[PDB]
Amino acid sequence: TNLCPFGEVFNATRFASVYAWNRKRISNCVADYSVLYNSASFSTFKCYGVSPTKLNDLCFTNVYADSFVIRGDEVRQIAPGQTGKIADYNYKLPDDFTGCVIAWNSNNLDSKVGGNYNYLYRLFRKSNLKPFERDISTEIYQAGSTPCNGVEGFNCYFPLQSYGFQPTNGVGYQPYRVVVLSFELLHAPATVCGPK
Amino acid sequence: QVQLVQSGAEMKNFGSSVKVSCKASGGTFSINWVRQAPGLGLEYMGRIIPALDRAIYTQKFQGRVTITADKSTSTVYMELSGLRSEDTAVYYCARSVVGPTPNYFDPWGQGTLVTVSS
Amino acid sequence: EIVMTQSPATLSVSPGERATLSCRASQSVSSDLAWYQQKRGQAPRLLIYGASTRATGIPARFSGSGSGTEFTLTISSLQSEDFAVYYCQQYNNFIAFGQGTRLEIK
Ligand SMILES: *[C@@H]1O[C@H](CO)[C@@H](O)[C@H](O)[C@H]1NC(C)=O
Protein backbone atom coordinates (compact mmCIF):
# COMPACT_ATOMS: atom_id res chain seq x y z
CA THR A 1 0.00 0.00 0.00
CA ASN A 2 1.63 3.20 1.23
CA LEU A 3 5.34 3.95 1.12
CA CYS A 4 7.53 2.76 3.97
CA PRO A 5 9.05 5.14 6.54
CA PHE A 6 12.23 3.01 6.55
CA GLY A 7 14.20 5.89 5.05
CA GLU A 8 13.70 8.07 8.13
CA VAL A 9 15.31 5.47 10.40
CA PHE A 10 18.49 5.14 8.35
CA ASN A 11 18.65 8.77 7.20
CA ALA A 12 17.95 10.30 10.61
CA THR A 13 20.69 12.86 11.18
CA ARG A 14 20.73 12.14 14.92
CA PHE A 15 20.88 8.82 16.76
CA ALA A 16 20.63 8.80 20.53
CA SER A 17 23.36 7.21 22.61
CA VAL A 18 23.36 3.49 23.34
CA TYR A 19 22.26 3.82 26.98
CA ALA A 20 19.05 5.56 25.83
CA TRP A 21 18.35 4.02 22.44
CA ASN A 22 15.53 5.49 20.37
CA ARG A 23 12.96 2.83 19.47
CA LYS A 24 10.80 3.66 16.45
CA ARG A 25 7.56 1.71 16.11
CA ILE A 26 6.85 0.79 12.48
CA SER A 27 3.37 0.59 10.98
CA ASN A 28 1.76 1.06 7.56
CA CYS A 29 4.93 0.33 5.57
CA VAL A 30 6.00 -1.59 2.48
CA ALA A 31 8.90 -3.94 3.24
CA ASP A 32 11.27 -2.69 0.54
CA TYR A 33 14.52 -4.23 1.77
CA SER A 34 15.92 -4.72 -1.75
CA VAL A 35 17.63 -1.32 -1.77
CA LEU A 36 19.04 -1.95 1.71
CA TYR A 37 20.45 -5.37 0.79
CA ASN A 38 21.89 -4.12 -2.50
CA SER A 39 23.43 -1.16 -0.65
CA ALA A 40 27.23 -1.27 -0.48
CA SER A 41 27.34 1.24 2.39
CA PHE A 42 26.38 -1.34 5.04
CA SER A 43 29.59 -2.90 6.35
CA THR A 44 27.86 -5.46 8.59
CA PHE A 45 24.43 -6.89 7.74
CA LYS A 46 24.42 -10.06 9.85
CA CYS A 47 20.77 -11.06 10.30
CA TYR A 48 19.89 -13.45 13.14
CA GLY A 49 16.86 -15.69 12.73
CA VAL A 50 16.21 -14.65 9.11
CA SER A 51 18.11 -14.73 5.84
CA PRO A 52 19.14 -11.36 4.37
CA THR A 53 17.64 -12.09 0.95
CA LYS A 54 14.27 -13.14 2.40
CA LEU A 55 13.69 -9.63 3.81
CA ASN A 56 12.35 -8.36 0.48
CA ASP A 57 9.32 -10.70 0.34
CA LEU A 58 8.06 -11.41 3.86
CA CYS A 59 5.20 -10.33 6.12
CA PHE A 60 6.26 -8.74 9.42
CA THR A 61 3.86 -8.59 12.37
CA ASN A 62 5.51 -5.52 13.93
CA VAL A 63 8.88 -3.84 13.45
CA TYR A 64 10.89 -1.93 16.06
CA ALA A 65 13.88 0.03 14.76
CA ASP A 66 16.24 0.69 17.67
CA SER A 67 19.22 2.80 16.61
CA PHE A 68 22.34 3.90 18.48
CA VAL A 69 26.06 4.61 18.09
CA ILE A 70 29.00 2.35 18.99
CA ARG A 71 32.78 2.73 18.88
CA GLY A 72 34.78 1.46 15.92
CA ASP A 73 36.30 -1.43 17.82
CA GLU A 74 33.89 -4.09 19.10
CA VAL A 75 30.94 -3.12 16.92
CA ARG A 76 29.85 -6.78 17.14
CA GLN A 77 28.99 -6.41 20.84
CA ILE A 78 25.32 -6.25 19.81
CA ALA A 79 25.35 -9.86 18.63
CA PRO A 80 23.38 -12.04 21.07
CA GLY A 81 25.46 -13.94 23.59
CA GLN A 82 28.30 -11.40 23.31
CA THR A 83 29.24 -10.04 26.73
CA GLY A 84 30.93 -6.67 27.20
CA LYS A 85 30.54 -3.35 28.95
CA ILE A 86 28.25 -1.84 26.31
CA ALA A 87 26.46 -5.15 25.77
CA ASP A 88 25.85 -5.91 29.45
CA TYR A 89 25.11 -2.36 30.59
CA ASN A 90 23.86 -0.12 27.75
CA TYR A 91 21.96 -2.31 25.25
CA LYS A 92 21.71 -6.09 25.51
CA LEU A 93 20.16 -7.85 22.55
CA PRO A 94 18.45 -10.96 23.97
CA ASP A 95 20.19 -14.28 23.38
CA ASP A 96 17.11 -15.57 21.54
CA PHE A 97 16.86 -12.69 19.06
CA THR A 98 14.79 -12.49 15.86
CA GLY A 99 15.98 -9.60 13.70
CA CYS A 100 18.78 -8.16 11.61
CA VAL A 101 21.47 -5.90 13.05
CA ILE A 102 22.95 -3.63 10.37
CA ALA A 103 25.89 -1.35 11.13
CA TRP A 104 28.19 0.77 8.98
CA ASN A 105 31.07 3.17 9.49
CA SER A 106 29.75 6.64 10.27
CA ASN A 107 33.09 8.40 10.77
CA ASN A 108 32.29 10.94 8.06
CA LEU A 109 28.81 11.35 9.56
CA ASP A 110 29.01 11.09 13.37
CA SER A 111 32.64 12.07 14.05
CA LYS A 112 33.87 15.66 14.33
CA VAL A 113 37.44 16.95 14.24
CA GLY A 114 38.80 17.13 17.77
CA GLY A 115 36.28 14.66 19.15
CA ASN A 116 32.51 14.32 19.33
CA TYR A 117 31.51 13.21 22.83
CA ASN A 118 27.71 13.48 22.55
CA TYR A 119 27.37 9.69 22.55
CA LEU A 120 28.03 8.12 25.94
CA TYR A 121 27.65 4.75 27.65
CA ARG A 122 26.93 3.62 31.21
CA LEU A 123 30.29 2.20 32.24
CA PHE A 124 29.21 1.24 35.77
CA ARG A 125 25.95 -0.26 37.01
CA LYS A 126 24.83 -2.27 40.03
CA SER A 127 23.66 -5.15 37.83
CA ASN A 128 23.81 -6.11 34.18
CA LEU A 129 20.98 -4.56 32.18
CA LYS A 130 17.93 -6.71 31.55
CA PRO A 131 17.59 -7.77 27.90
CA PHE A 132 15.99 -5.31 25.47
CA GLU A 133 15.54 -2.54 28.05
CA ARG A 134 16.68 1.02 28.72
CA ASP A 135 17.83 2.37 32.09
CA ILE A 136 18.40 6.13 31.95
CA SER A 137 18.93 6.28 35.72
CA THR A 138 21.93 8.52 36.43
CA GLU A 139 22.38 8.19 40.19
CA ILE A 140 25.87 8.04 41.65
CA TYR A 141 27.17 4.48 41.66
CA GLN A 142 28.43 3.14 44.99
CA ALA A 143 31.66 1.13 44.83
CA GLY A 144 32.47 1.39 48.54
CA SER A 145 31.04 0.50 51.92
CA THR A 146 30.22 4.11 52.74
CA PRO A 147 26.81 5.14 51.35
CA CYS A 148 27.35 7.80 48.70
CA ASN A 149 24.06 9.43 49.78
CA GLY A 150 23.35 10.48 46.20
CA VAL A 151 26.69 12.27 46.28
CA GLU A 152 29.80 11.64 44.19
CA GLY A 153 32.69 10.74 46.48
CA PHE A 154 35.55 8.33 46.92
CA ASN A 155 34.54 4.85 45.73
CA CYS A 156 31.50 6.59 44.19
CA TYR A 157 31.21 6.92 40.42
CA PHE A 158 28.91 8.38 37.82
CA PRO A 159 27.41 5.60 35.68
CA LEU A 160 27.76 7.15 32.20
CA GLN A 161 31.09 7.48 30.40
CA SER A 162 31.44 9.33 27.10
CA TYR A 163 32.83 7.73 23.95
CA GLY A 164 36.11 8.80 22.42
CA PHE A 165 35.42 9.41 18.72
CA GLN A 166 38.20 10.98 16.65
CA PRO A 167 38.23 11.07 12.83
CA THR A 168 42.01 10.66 12.89
CA ASN A 169 41.83 7.19 14.45
CA GLY A 170 41.14 4.32 12.08
CA VAL A 171 39.11 1.17 12.67
CA GLY A 172 39.93 1.47 16.37
CA TYR A 173 37.85 4.61 17.01
CA GLN A 174 35.10 5.38 14.48
CA PRO A 175 31.36 5.91 15.11
CA TYR A 176 29.66 2.73 13.90
CA ARG A 177 25.94 3.46 14.17
CA VAL A 178 23.84 0.33 14.65
CA VAL A 179 20.21 -0.06 13.59
CA VAL A 180 18.77 -3.20 15.17
CA LEU A 181 15.74 -4.11 13.05
CA SER A 182 14.02 -6.33 15.58
CA PHE A 183 10.75 -7.49 14.04
CA GLU A 184 8.46 -10.51 13.55
CA LEU A 185 6.56 -10.17 16.82
CA LEU A 186 3.98 -12.77 15.69
CA HIS A 187 1.34 -11.24 17.97
CA ALA A 188 -1.04 -9.34 15.66
CA PRO A 189 -2.01 -9.04 11.98
CA ALA A 190 1.03 -7.98 9.99
CA THR A 191 1.20 -4.33 8.95
CA VAL A 192 4.52 -4.83 7.10
CA CYS A 193 4.80 -7.10 4.06
CA GLY A 194 6.90 -7.43 0.93
CA PRO A 195 5.95 -5.65 -2.28
CA LYS A 196 3.79 -7.43 -4.83
CA GLN B 1 41.64 28.35 24.04
CA VAL B 2 38.78 30.63 25.08
CA GLN B 3 37.66 29.77 28.60
CA LEU B 4 33.99 29.15 29.29
CA VAL B 5 32.60 32.55 30.24
CA GLN B 6 30.97 32.67 33.67
CA SER B 7 29.23 35.38 35.69
CA GLY B 8 28.97 35.43 39.47
CA ALA B 9 28.27 37.84 42.29
CA GLU B 10 31.10 39.24 44.41
CA MET B 11 31.34 40.59 47.96
CA LYS B 12 28.06 39.26 49.33
CA ASN B 13 27.25 39.65 53.01
CA PHE B 14 26.85 36.83 55.52
CA GLY B 15 23.98 34.40 55.05
CA SER B 16 23.32 35.45 51.45
CA SER B 17 23.31 33.22 48.37
CA VAL B 18 25.56 33.75 45.34
CA LYS B 19 24.24 32.72 41.92
CA VAL B 20 27.05 31.99 39.46
CA SER B 21 26.60 30.41 36.02
CA CYS B 22 28.83 29.67 33.02
CA LYS B 23 27.87 29.54 29.34
CA ALA B 24 28.50 26.10 27.85
CA SER B 25 29.95 25.93 24.35
CA GLY B 26 27.48 23.22 23.35
CA GLY B 27 27.18 19.45 23.56
CA THR B 28 26.94 16.78 26.24
CA PHE B 29 30.13 17.86 28.02
CA SER B 30 29.62 17.81 31.77
CA ILE B 31 30.16 21.01 33.77
CA ASN B 32 32.07 20.50 37.06
CA TRP B 33 32.32 22.79 40.09
CA VAL B 34 35.74 23.45 41.64
CA ARG B 35 36.25 25.55 44.78
CA GLN B 36 39.64 27.13 45.47
CA ALA B 37 40.26 28.60 48.90
CA PRO B 38 42.64 31.59 48.87
CA GLY B 39 46.19 30.27 48.96
CA LEU B 40 45.16 26.66 49.58
CA GLY B 41 44.51 23.42 47.73
CA LEU B 42 41.68 23.21 45.23
CA GLU B 43 38.43 21.47 46.17
CA TYR B 44 35.65 19.81 44.18
CA MET B 45 32.03 20.75 44.87
CA GLY B 46 30.02 18.82 42.29
CA ARG B 47 28.85 18.71 38.70
CA ILE B 48 25.74 18.91 36.53
CA ILE B 49 25.46 17.42 33.04
CA PRO B 50 23.79 20.15 30.94
CA ALA B 51 22.05 17.78 28.53
CA LEU B 52 20.70 15.38 31.15
CA ASP B 53 20.27 18.00 33.92
CA ARG B 54 21.56 15.56 36.55
CA ALA B 55 22.55 17.01 39.92
CA ILE B 56 25.80 15.92 41.60
CA TYR B 57 27.04 17.17 44.97
CA THR B 58 29.82 16.51 47.49
CA GLN B 59 29.42 15.28 51.06
CA LYS B 60 31.29 18.38 52.22
CA PHE B 61 28.94 20.67 50.29
CA GLN B 62 25.68 18.68 50.37
CA GLY B 63 22.70 20.98 50.83
CA ARG B 64 24.77 24.15 51.06
CA VAL B 65 25.34 24.26 47.29
CA THR B 66 22.57 24.16 44.69
CA ILE B 67 23.06 23.83 40.93
CA THR B 68 20.46 24.63 38.26
CA ALA B 69 20.55 24.43 34.46
CA ASP B 70 19.08 26.98 32.03
CA LYS B 71 18.64 25.21 28.70
CA SER B 72 17.68 28.29 26.66
CA THR B 73 21.19 29.77 26.81
CA SER B 74 22.73 26.41 27.84
CA THR B 75 23.96 27.84 31.15
CA VAL B 76 24.22 26.03 34.49
CA TYR B 77 23.74 28.15 37.62
CA MET B 78 25.22 27.65 41.08
CA GLU B 79 23.48 28.94 44.21
CA LEU B 80 25.26 28.66 47.56
CA SER B 81 22.73 29.27 50.33
CA GLY B 82 25.03 29.25 53.38
CA LEU B 83 28.15 31.41 53.47
CA ARG B 84 30.92 31.22 56.07
CA SER B 85 33.88 33.42 56.92
CA GLU B 86 36.32 30.89 55.45
CA ASP B 87 34.00 30.26 52.47
CA THR B 88 35.41 33.25 50.55
CA ALA B 89 36.70 30.96 47.81
CA VAL B 90 36.86 31.31 44.04
CA TYR B 91 34.45 28.88 42.37
CA TYR B 92 35.68 27.61 39.00
CA CYS B 93 33.46 26.33 36.22
CA ALA B 94 35.23 23.43 34.51
CA ARG B 95 34.18 21.54 31.39
CA SER B 96 35.19 17.88 31.39
CA VAL B 97 34.33 14.81 29.35
CA VAL B 98 31.47 13.18 31.22
CA GLY B 99 32.81 10.16 33.05
CA PRO B 100 32.45 8.12 36.24
CA THR B 101 34.89 10.60 37.79
CA PRO B 102 35.37 14.26 36.85
CA ASN B 103 37.93 13.94 34.08
CA TYR B 104 40.56 16.47 32.99
CA PHE B 105 39.13 20.00 33.15
CA ASP B 106 39.48 20.82 29.47
CA PRO B 107 38.98 23.75 29.49
CA TRP B 108 38.50 25.82 32.65
CA GLY B 109 36.20 28.79 33.08
CA GLN B 110 36.89 32.43 33.80
CA GLY B 111 36.88 32.18 37.59
CA THR B 112 34.74 34.36 39.86
CA LEU B 113 36.27 35.79 43.02
CA VAL B 114 33.83 35.93 45.94
CA THR B 115 34.46 37.70 49.25
CA VAL B 116 32.44 37.70 52.47
CA SER B 117 31.74 40.79 54.58
CA SER B 118 30.78 39.81 58.12
CA GLU C 1 40.24 8.28 50.75
CA ILE C 2 43.02 8.84 48.21
CA VAL C 3 45.20 11.90 48.87
CA MET C 4 47.57 12.95 46.09
CA THR C 5 50.54 13.68 48.32
CA GLN C 6 53.26 15.62 46.51
CA SER C 7 56.68 15.27 48.14
CA PRO C 8 58.57 18.32 46.74
CA ALA C 9 55.89 20.90 47.53
CA THR C 10 58.49 23.68 47.67
CA LEU C 11 60.46 22.37 44.67
CA SER C 12 62.53 25.19 43.19
CA VAL C 13 64.99 25.19 40.29
CA SER C 14 66.82 27.94 38.46
CA PRO C 15 66.28 27.95 34.68
CA GLY C 16 67.92 24.89 33.19
CA GLU C 17 67.62 22.03 30.75
CA ARG C 18 66.00 19.68 33.29
CA ALA C 19 63.13 20.20 35.73
CA THR C 20 61.72 17.55 38.06
CA LEU C 21 58.30 17.30 39.71
CA SER C 22 56.75 14.41 41.64
CA CYS C 23 53.32 13.11 42.62
CA ARG C 24 52.25 10.17 44.77
CA ALA C 25 49.00 8.45 45.72
CA SER C 26 47.85 6.64 48.84
CA GLN C 27 46.40 3.81 46.73
CA SER C 28 46.90 2.31 43.29
CA VAL C 29 46.27 4.62 40.32
CA SER C 30 45.61 3.08 36.90
CA SER C 31 47.60 5.80 35.14
CA ASP C 32 44.73 8.30 35.29
CA LEU C 33 46.79 11.33 36.33
CA ALA C 34 46.55 14.90 35.08
CA TRP C 35 48.67 18.02 35.53
CA TYR C 36 47.12 21.49 35.67
CA GLN C 37 49.25 24.61 35.19
CA GLN C 38 47.95 27.24 37.62
CA LYS C 39 49.72 30.52 36.94
CA ARG C 40 49.85 33.24 39.58
CA GLY C 41 46.51 35.03 39.53
CA GLN C 42 45.26 32.90 36.64
CA ALA C 43 42.77 30.16 35.97
CA PRO C 44 44.24 26.64 35.73
CA ARG C 45 44.85 25.00 32.36
CA LEU C 46 45.10 21.31 31.54
CA LEU C 47 48.56 20.03 30.59
CA ILE C 48 48.50 16.20 30.50
CA TYR C 49 44.98 14.83 30.01
CA GLY C 50 46.46 11.34 30.00
CA ALA C 51 49.01 10.01 32.43
CA SER C 52 51.76 11.09 30.01
CA THR C 53 49.92 12.23 26.85
CA ARG C 54 50.31 16.00 26.68
CA ALA C 55 47.43 18.32 25.82
CA THR C 56 46.15 19.42 22.42
CA GLY C 57 47.37 22.98 22.98
CA ILE C 58 51.08 23.80 22.84
CA PRO C 59 52.69 21.80 25.69
CA ALA C 60 55.87 21.55 23.57
CA ARG C 61 58.88 20.44 25.73
CA PHE C 62 56.45 19.33 28.51
CA SER C 63 56.42 15.56 29.06
CA GLY C 64 54.50 13.45 31.52
CA SER C 65 55.86 10.14 32.74
CA GLY C 66 55.25 7.45 35.33
CA SER C 67 52.56 4.94 36.27
CA GLY C 68 51.20 3.37 39.43
CA THR C 69 51.81 5.09 42.75
CA GLU C 70 54.73 7.25 41.57
CA PHE C 71 54.34 9.97 38.94
CA THR C 72 56.78 12.57 37.64
CA LEU C 73 56.91 15.47 35.20
CA THR C 74 59.90 16.84 33.29
CA ILE C 75 60.24 19.85 30.99
CA SER C 76 63.23 20.48 28.72
CA SER C 77 62.60 24.18 28.01
CA LEU C 78 62.07 25.92 31.36
CA GLN C 79 61.05 29.39 30.23
CA SER C 80 60.13 32.07 32.76
CA GLU C 81 56.47 32.19 31.71
CA ASP C 82 55.74 28.49 32.22
CA PHE C 83 56.89 28.78 35.84
CA ALA C 84 53.73 28.28 37.90
CA VAL C 85 52.03 26.02 40.42
CA TYR C 86 51.29 22.57 38.98
CA TYR C 87 48.42 20.73 40.69
CA CYS C 88 48.65 16.97 40.38
CA GLN C 89 45.18 15.49 39.81
CA GLN C 90 43.94 11.91 40.07
CA TYR C 91 40.61 10.56 38.81
CA ASN C 92 41.15 6.78 38.84
CA ASN C 93 38.79 6.47 41.83
CA PHE C 94 37.50 9.98 42.56
CA ILE C 95 38.53 13.54 41.81
CA ALA C 96 41.37 14.12 44.28
CA PHE C 97 43.54 17.22 44.07
CA GLY C 98 47.08 17.21 45.38
CA GLN C 99 48.01 20.04 47.72
CA GLY C 100 50.03 21.59 44.91
CA THR C 101 53.68 21.99 43.89
CA ARG C 102 55.00 25.52 43.57
CA LEU C 103 57.99 26.05 41.29
CA GLU C 104 60.53 28.78 42.04
CA ILE C 105 63.68 30.16 40.44
CA LYS C 106 66.00 29.28 43.34
C1 LIG D 1 18.19 8.22 2.30
O2 LIG D 1 18.01 6.80 2.35
C3 LIG D 1 18.15 6.16 1.08
C4 LIG D 1 17.85 4.69 1.29
O5 LIG D 1 16.59 4.51 1.92
C6 LIG D 1 19.56 6.40 0.52
O7 LIG D 1 19.64 5.83 -0.78
C8 LIG D 1 19.85 7.89 0.46
O9 LIG D 1 21.21 8.11 0.08
C10 LIG D 1 19.60 8.54 1.82
N11 LIG D 1 19.80 9.98 1.74
C12 LIG D 1 20.44 10.68 2.69
C13 LIG D 1 20.56 12.15 2.45
O14 LIG D 1 20.90 10.14 3.69
Q: Is residue A146 part of a domain?
A: no
Here the CATH number for the domain that contains residue A65 is 3.30.70.1840
User: Three-class SS of residue A169?
Assistant: coil
Determined by which method? cryo-EM
Which residues, including other chains, have CB under 8 Å from residue A90's CB and lie 6 or more apart? A17, A18, A19, A68, A121, A122, A129
DSSP letter assigned to residue A160: E
- Say how far apart CA B55 and CA A60 lie, in whole Å: 43
One-letter amino acid of B109: G
Residue with CA at minimum distance from ligand 1 atom 7: A35
Domain that holds residue C39: 20-97
Round to whole Å and give the CA distance between C54 and A3. Answer: 53
Domain assignment present for C86 = yes
Residue A118 belongs to some domain of the structure? yes
Q: Are B5 and B28 in contact (CB under 8 A)?
A: no
**A118, A138, A161 ranked by CB distance to B99: nearest:** A161
Angstrom distances, CA of residue A83 to CA of A23, A43, A72, A92:
22, 22, 17, 9
Q: Is residue B50 within 8 Å of B69, Cβ to Cβ? A: yes
Resolution of the entry in angstroms: 3.9
In a domain, C34, yes or no: yes
Please, what's the b/e burial string for B80-96 (b: 16 or more CB within 10 A of its CB; e: otherwise)? Answer: beebeeebbbbbbbbbb
Domain residue limits at A165: 6-123+161-193
With respect to residue A16, please indicate whether it lies within any of the assigned structural domains: yes
In a domain, A92, yes or no: yes
User: Which domain CATH number covers C91?
Assistant: 2.60.40.10
- Assign residue A128 a region: left if phi > 0, alpha if psi is -120 to 50, beta otherwise? beta
Q: What is the tally of structural domains in chain A?
A: 1
Q: Looking at ligand 1, which residue's alpha carbon is closest to its atom 10?
A: A11
Residue A171 lies in a domain: yes
DSSP B21: E
Residue A138 lies in a domain: no
- Cβ of A86: how many Cβ atoms within 10 Å? 23
Total domain count for chain C?
1
Q: Is residue A148 part of a domain?
A: no
Determine the residue among A160, A163, A166, A173 to mutate to test chain B binding: the one whose Cβ has the most chain B Cβ atoms within 10 Å: A160
For residue C7, tell me if it sits in a domain: no
Which residue, judged by its Cα, is nearest atom 5 of ligand 1? A7
For every residue of C55-85, which 3-state class applies, written as one string? CCCCCCCEEEECCCCEEEEEECCCCCCCCCE
Say how many CB pairs under 8 Å bridge B and C: 48
Mutate to test the pocket of ligand 1, among A4, A6, A8, A10 (most ligand atoms within 8 A of CB): A10
Q: Say which residues have a Cβ less than 8 Å from residue B110's Cβ, sequence separation at least 6.
A: B3, B4, B5, B6, B22, B93, C43
Interface test with B, best of C40, C45, C46 (most B CBs within 10 A): C46
- Chain B residues near residue C44 by CB distance under 8 angstroms: 42, 92, 105, 108
Measuring CA to CA, how many Å separate A150 from each of A139, B64, B66?
A: 6, 15, 14
| Domains of chain B and any CATH numbers | 6-117 (2.60.40.10)
Is A145 part of any domain? Answer: no
